[PDB]
Amino acid sequence: WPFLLRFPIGCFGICLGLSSQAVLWLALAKSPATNFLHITPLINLVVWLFSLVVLVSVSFTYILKCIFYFEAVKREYFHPVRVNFFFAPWVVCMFLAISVPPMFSPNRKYLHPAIWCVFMGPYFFLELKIYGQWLSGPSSHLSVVGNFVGAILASKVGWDEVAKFLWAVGFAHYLVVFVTLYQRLPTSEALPKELHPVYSMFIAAPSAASIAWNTIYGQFDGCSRTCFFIALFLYISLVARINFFTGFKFSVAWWSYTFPMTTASVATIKYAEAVPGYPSRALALTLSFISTAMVCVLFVSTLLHAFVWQTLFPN
Amino acid sequence: WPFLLRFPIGCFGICLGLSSQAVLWLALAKSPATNFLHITPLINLVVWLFSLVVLVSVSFTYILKCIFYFEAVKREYFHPVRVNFFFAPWVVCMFLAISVPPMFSPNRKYLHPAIWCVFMGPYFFLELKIYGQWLSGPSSHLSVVGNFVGAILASKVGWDEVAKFLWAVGFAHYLVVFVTLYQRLPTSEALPKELHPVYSMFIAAPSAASIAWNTIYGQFDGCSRTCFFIALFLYISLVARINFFTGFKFSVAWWSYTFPMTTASVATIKYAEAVPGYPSRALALTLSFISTAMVCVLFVSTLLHAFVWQTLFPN
Amino acid sequence: WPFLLRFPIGCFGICLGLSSQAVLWLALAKSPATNFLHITPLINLVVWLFSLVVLVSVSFTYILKCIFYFEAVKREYFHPVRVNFFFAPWVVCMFLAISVPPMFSPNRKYLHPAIWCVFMGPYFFLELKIYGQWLSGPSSHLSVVGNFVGAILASKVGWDEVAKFLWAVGFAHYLVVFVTLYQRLPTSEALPKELHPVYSMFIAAPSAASIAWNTIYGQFDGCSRTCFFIALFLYISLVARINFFTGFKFSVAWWSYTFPMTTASVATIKYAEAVPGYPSRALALTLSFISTAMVCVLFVSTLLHAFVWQTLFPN
Ligand SMILES: CC(C)CCC[C@@H](C)[C@H]1CC[C@H]2[C@@H]3CC=C4C[C@@H](OC(=O)CCC(=O)O)CC[C@]4(C)[C@H]3CC[C@]12C
Ligand SMILES: CC(C)CCC[C@@H](C)[C@H]1CC[C@H]2[C@@H]3CC=C4C[C@@H](OC(=O)CCC(=O)O)CC[C@]4(C)[C@H]3CC[C@]12C
Ligand SMILES: CC(C)CCC[C@@H](C)[C@H]1CC[C@H]2[C@@H]3CC=C4C[C@@H](OC(=O)CCC(=O)O)CC[C@]4(C)[C@H]3CC[C@]12C
Ligand SMILES: [Cl-]
Ligand SMILES: [Cl-]
Ligand SMILES: [Cl-]
Ligand SMILES: [Cl-]
Ligand SMILES: [Cl-]
Ligand SMILES: [Cl-]
């Protein structure tokens, strides 16, 4: 059993969670509402560099597999559940782009338009091609989160009009996913094993949509508030449904679940700036504290379970 | 056959219809657009007291059954069609709360926040628990109307922010219900017998949503108008589809159908205040006249059929 | 085989495409953004008269069949796929009404209210009756486009309030159609033959809705922009999915596909007026050029294939 076979596409899950952490701490240092913490922006410098190293190493190793064992890649593509992970490498690169650590880049009004085109295009072509396969042969193949994220990148460039077009496309696909998935949610028992990639974008897409609305227009309306509150209601359902009595075991799939929690925390900070008050401030800090704590303990657990015991990679 | 067995949970239907009548006549006396009628506010005083008596008597008798024959209550819970009626006792109490007869309460800016918490919480816990049962074992178990009604109560207290959160949650559940129920509407023949509790909230939830929007913001927009017009279009479909040639017979289920009609009438009065004109005024009065007439004739019929013949309660 | 049997209801398809062309060229002559072309309004005079001749001839011949062979009409009604075409004669008359060639009518603020009632009523009665048949015996029987078109006619009369009511009804039916049709789109192979009437209103209803919003309110908002962008995204999917390598053959069904393209072009012109700029202007002209070119080449092809070879009408 060579190492290439035991290396699946699920490795990209860890990069998405860690990269999403970078945007959270950037806000905590550039938030006028949360100025009283005096958080040093140097934290983002370490986190952003760490996200680049893991993304390059993961991507480079996977490229070697694609030339060495193309047939293995071909087999993975067809399987229905693990298809969504093909979108993961493209969407994560956009997350680093919006971070854009202040120290590296001298102050400028907008980023160069060339950056948007290179990252965005491979995603749009993949979205249409993967959608066509479903018709030839649920509706879980559709990608929703990436379109909302691209709108944020487009707003940073300054192309306001195209950002509105991407938001409309992302919303339309959400309706089909929302109706089907809500009817049959996964059972509390054996939650991580079943439909783990698909579920993550169910508690995350609304929170991303609210952030995109704030960048395009600049003022909160019913779109940003209601989408944010829907995500909060869905997030609360996890606590009530999860069984505290039932035991839990370590699994690689836990890395993907981190990403939904982080996106909600960033969205809450936007709400606090628009509407000041003691309620919002405490709620924003609480969500951030839970998100960052889970990553730190999970990072230690996934580090020990891979080195001394080499149980991270199954046969 | 003891009286406890022949006493079902459908008795709560009559309370919902009569309690909804109270809010209608309160508006008719406090509407600047309909000032020319000079309606005495004393009508609400009689109606509100009458609603309290029936609600207490119905609730007190049912509590006796729950301790005497718990297993009978347990059997009723599982059956799919008659599950929605468990939400009915909680939602109706909120309807009396908004009425708040002026004579009883000295003029005050807002009501005490404690009233909102006691009534609302048992409903939110019930909504999550009942929804979980569906996943373990359509989508008719979901409750939609109560969330919109709670927003009205929250606005009366003055907690504007939480009212927006409840409205978002209620809207999201409506999408699943609207798609499924619209595909298979009940046939005109044997209309009352089939799916009678579920259908009532289909012509009623839009009208409640429009009222909630007016209280939170204060100015009509596309939300209030389009939701109100959707309810009107759905209400008109009943007249066209119902068969006049086919005969009708007395049934206990008719009490639930009163509640949808009353809610639409109250919503129309809001429209008349925002947009004045002869068209709206006549339409508002016509809907109220039909609603109040149906209750009076139905009340007499349900009174005679229960006393001289004792045919109200089946075996 | 008498000519009456070989004359189907699909003949009304050609009238819808040609009549829709009339509104496009009217805008091109009355558009301040596209003033630099100096397009003579005389083009609409020829087109509008040509649309009236074909509509009268098609309608008059079909009336003869309805009295001669009523049973044949009765058989056609039941078949599920070819039911939507019954709505086509009524909706097309509204399209000529909005055109209202300037030369014929002296300048006036609004049109007489009587015109709206005569055309609209037969459509509303048909919508309710056809919808009832589905319940007694997908959800493709529902009509969506006509309600949005009627709102435009109502706005021309000046009855603003009723136009909002029609828009709400049309939107509600769209949700059921959008969810069902999007799940199972037709395959690229043998595209014209399968579900040809139903598909045409899928790329067309959003574009009609955006135009109606602009007339009722007068200022673009998120309704007009997002609905327009959804239609653009759906239109682009046709180019990617269609197979260029696969050959194509002449068919009568191609006339219906013209109508979706024209409606999108008219909607784009509205966008250019609201938001000026070089991007929008070129995109508006390009869509119009493709639409008008397709009609001209198709008109020649459908003319030659019917006269020398008499292959237009199948047995
Ligand atoms: C794909 C995800 C990100 C969104 C899924 C949710 C949408 C299907 C629905 C939920 C409720 C709907 C909203 C209902 C109420 C409003 C407020 C409505 O009225 C306003 O104009 C708000 C601002 C104001 O004028 O005060 C604007 C659109 C919006 C947000 C609606 C847009 C579509 C929403 C967000
Ligand atoms: C759960 C029930 C109560 C609502 C179900 C209906 C909604 C799914 C849809 C129907 C049409 C949609 C509306 C379409 C048009 C508008 C107007 C739109 O534009 C405006 O800003 C209106 C006010 C103005 O700016 O003039 C605001 C949101 C809204 C109401 C939309 C919100 C979501 C609505 C109400
Ligand atoms: C039946 C067809 C014609 C429409 C099908 C699409 C609708 C189901 C959804 C898609 C996204 C929704 C929209 C989402 C965002 C908005 C913007 C929202 O916010 C605004 O107030 C826009 C204007 C502004 O205030 O800047 C108003 C309603 C609207 C258009 C929503 C109404 C309902 C929409 C159009
Ligand atoms: Cl940001
Ligand atoms: Cl996705
Ligand atoms: Cl009220
Ligand atoms: Cl309910
Ligand atoms: Cl026009
Ligand atoms: Cl249609």
Numbering used by the authors:
A (entry chain B), B (entry chain A), C (entry chain C): 182 to 318, 329 to 506
What does the report in the manuscript say about this coordinate set?
Slow anion channel associated 1 (SLAC1) is a slow (S)-type anion channel that generates anion (Cl- and nitrate) efflux on the guard cell plasma membrane and acts as a key effector of stomatal closure. Trimeric SLAC1 harbors N-terminal and C-terminal intracellular domains (ICDs) with the transmembrane domain (TMD) positioned in the middle. Multiple serine/threonine phosphorylation in the N-terminal and C-terminal intracellular domains activates SLAC120,21,27,28. To reveal the activation mechanism of SLAC1 unequivocally, here we report cryo-EM structures of AtSLAC1 with different phosphomimetic states: wild-type (WT) in an open state, 6D (T62D/S65D/S107D/S124D/S146D/S152D)29 in both open and closed states, and 8D (S59D/T62D/S65D/S86D/S107D/S124D/S146D/S152D) in a closed state.
Moderately conductive AtSLAC1 6D mutant adopted both the open and closed conformations. We obtained an open conformation of AtSLAC1 6D from the grids of relatively lower sample concentrations and sparse particle distribution. In order to achieve better resolution from homogeneous population, we selected two datasets showing mostly open conformation to determine the open state and a dataset featuring a large proportion of the closed conformation to determine the closed state structure with C3 symmetry, both at resolution of 3.3 Å. AtSLAC1 6D open state was modeled with the TMD region (residues 182-318, 329-506) except the faint density of intracellular loop 2 (ICL2) (residues 319–328), and closed state was modeled with the TMD and an intracellular plug (residues 150-516). Key structural elements differentiating the open and closed states of AtSLAC1 6D are revealed by the relationship between the faint densities of ICD and ICL2. Both 2D class averages and map at a low contour level of the open structure show the faint ICD density that is connected to center of trimer. Unlike the closed structure, ICL2s in the center of trimer make contacts with ICD and are pulled away from TMD. In the open structure, the ICD apparently pulls the ICL2 to the intracellular side, hereinafter “extended state”. TM5 is partially unwound and bent away from the pore axis by 9.3 Å translation and 27-degree rotation. By contrast, in the open structure, the partial unwinding of TM5 from TMD permits a large cavity around the pore. Subsequent TM7 bending concomitant with slight outward movement of TM9 transforms the linear pore (P1) into the inverted Y-shaped pore with the second pore (P2) branching out from P1. By contrast, we only observed the other putative chloride ion site SInt on P2 in the open structure, but not in the closed structure due to the absence of P2.
